[PDB]
Design an enzyme around this catalytic site. Structure first.
Site, short mmCIF file in Angstrom:
data_model
loop_
_atom_site.label_atom_id
_atom_site.label_comp_id
_atom_site.label_asym_id
_atom_site.label_seq_id
_atom_site.Cartn_x
_atom_site.Cartn_y
_atom_site.Cartn_z
N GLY A 20 -61.03 44.63 -37.26
CA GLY A 20 -60.51 43.31 -36.92
C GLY A 20 -60.63 43.04 -35.43
O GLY A 20 -61.07 43.92 -34.68
N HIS A 21 -60.25 41.83 -35.00
CA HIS A 21 -60.31 41.38 -33.60
C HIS A 21 -59.55 42.33 -32.67
O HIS A 21 -60.15 42.96 -31.79
CB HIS A 21 -59.76 39.95 -33.45
CG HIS A 21 -60.53 38.90 -34.19
ND1 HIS A 21 -61.80 38.51 -33.79
CD2 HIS A 21 -60.17 38.17 -35.27
CE1 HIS A 21 -62.17 37.57 -34.65
NE2 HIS A 21 -61.22 37.33 -35.55
N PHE A 22 -58.24 42.47 -32.92
CA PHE A 22 -57.35 43.32 -32.14
C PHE A 22 -56.98 44.61 -32.90
O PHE A 22 -56.90 45.67 -32.29
CB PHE A 22 -56.10 42.53 -31.74
CG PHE A 22 -56.20 41.89 -30.37
CD1 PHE A 22 -55.65 42.51 -29.25
CD2 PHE A 22 -56.88 40.68 -30.19
CE1 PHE A 22 -55.77 41.93 -27.98
CE2 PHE A 22 -56.99 40.11 -28.92
CZ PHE A 22 -56.43 40.74 -27.83
N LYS A 44 -53.02 48.88 -40.89
CA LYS A 44 -53.48 48.14 -39.71
C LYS A 44 -52.69 48.57 -38.49
O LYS A 44 -51.48 48.40 -38.43
CB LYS A 44 -53.40 46.60 -39.91
CG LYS A 44 -54.10 45.80 -38.82
CD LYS A 44 -54.17 44.37 -39.21
CE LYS A 44 -54.97 43.55 -38.23
NZ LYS A 44 -55.24 42.19 -38.77
N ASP A 130 -59.39 32.12 -38.74
CA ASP A 130 -60.36 33.21 -38.89
C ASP A 130 -60.91 33.34 -40.33
O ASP A 130 -61.11 34.45 -40.83
CB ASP A 130 -59.67 34.51 -38.45
CG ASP A 130 -60.57 35.71 -38.28
OD1 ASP A 130 -61.61 35.58 -37.63
OD2 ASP A 130 -60.19 36.80 -38.75
#
Ligand SMILES: N#C[C@@H]1CCC[C@@H]1Nc1nc(-c2cn[nH]c2)nc2c1CC=NC2=O
Length: 281
Positions: A20-22, A44, A130
């Site tokens: 993922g992004h972060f 996550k 997103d």
């Protein structure tokens, strides 16, 4: 004891699921007994922006919809999001893999489901920011769920949108022009992204015809920081991504109407569902 409370010690990694992004999503077996018999869960954890992950966790924890990934719990000390594990993975790798197994009706049943989960999020005054095929997980051959909420944000009071501050990793080729120019996200913009996700769906998530690549054919892969600016114009002109190979016109017109240049003018999810159901029935 809380069933949504998960210990770090008992959370043993198996394999990396998705990036993922972060955040980083890895498959872990939560085994408190400690003998390879605990349930497999998707985990996550941020790469070494806690406020954002924390905010995502309170958004997911209060989402209860059949096409939205189930929140399983948390892990605190510093926090990790505990989600359910869907073994078929994301549309990104399932679609090329099972081309033969999945046909047009199944592809439009997927679109209705994505639309549905989308409407639930929208009716609860939240904007995704997103929406792409890599963020859609496969429950079964008949069911798909939205599996990531990394950039999901609340829409401000009396405001029709969320004003975007940082946008260093915004997926631009999936973005509406109001986001490309004004940098303010509207629910209507999540509809633009849906149309693009829809194109990926119909092309079975093929690298050589991904929404980035096809848009580049119309602008050029040698403009770095002009890429976005040219893209804004190609849309001002009236140009959109091409028709997927073996996609009907009536489907492509629903895809095209996902790209009505104005947010106030653009369709909602409820309209797209009824539009899709009109082809399935
Ligand atoms: N959906 C989604 C997003 C994409 C970014 C991180 C998150 N990824 C995830 N990626 C995968 C996966 C399986 N194959 N390829 C990916 N599974 C899962 C998740 C998130 C939650 N549960 C899963 O089962």
């Amino acid at each position: 004891v809380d069933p949504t409370h998960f210990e770090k010690r008992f959370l043993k990694r198996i394999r990396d699921l998705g990036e993922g992004h972060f955040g980083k999503v890895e498959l872990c077996r939560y085994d408190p007994e400690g003998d390879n018999t605990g349930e497999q869960v998707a985990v996550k954890s941020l790469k070494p922006h806690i406020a954002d992950l924390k905010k995502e966790i309170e958004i997911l924890r209060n989402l209860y919809h059949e096409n939205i990934v189930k929140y399983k719990g948390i892990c605190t000390e510093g926090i990790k999001l505990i989600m359910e594990f869907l073994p078929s993975g994301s549309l990104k790798e399932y679609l090329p893999k099972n081309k033969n197994k999945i046909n047009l009706k199944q592809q439009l049943k997927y679109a209705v489901q994505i639309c549905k989960g989308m409407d639930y999020l929208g009716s609860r005054q939240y904007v995704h920011r997103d929406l792409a095929a890599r963020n859609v997980l496969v429950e079964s051959e008949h069911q798909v769920k939205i599996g990531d909420f990394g950039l999901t944000k609340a829409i401000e009071t009396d405001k029709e949108y969320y004003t975007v501050k940082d946008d260093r990793d915004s997926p631009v080729f999936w973005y509406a022009p109001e986001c490309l120019m004004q940098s303010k996200f509207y629910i209507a913009s999540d509809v633009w992204s849906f149309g693009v996700t829809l194109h990926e769906l119909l092309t079975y998530c093929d690298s050589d015809s991904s929404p980035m690549a096809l848009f580049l054919k119309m602008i050029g892969p040698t403009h770095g920081q002009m890429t976005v600016t040219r893209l804004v114009n190609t849309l001002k002109e009236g140009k959109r991504l091409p028709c997927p190979p073996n996609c009907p016109d009536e489907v492509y017109q629903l895809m095209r109407k996902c790209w009505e240049f104005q947010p106030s003018n653009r369709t909602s999810f409820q309209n797209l569902i009824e539009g899709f159901e009109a082809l399935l029935k």
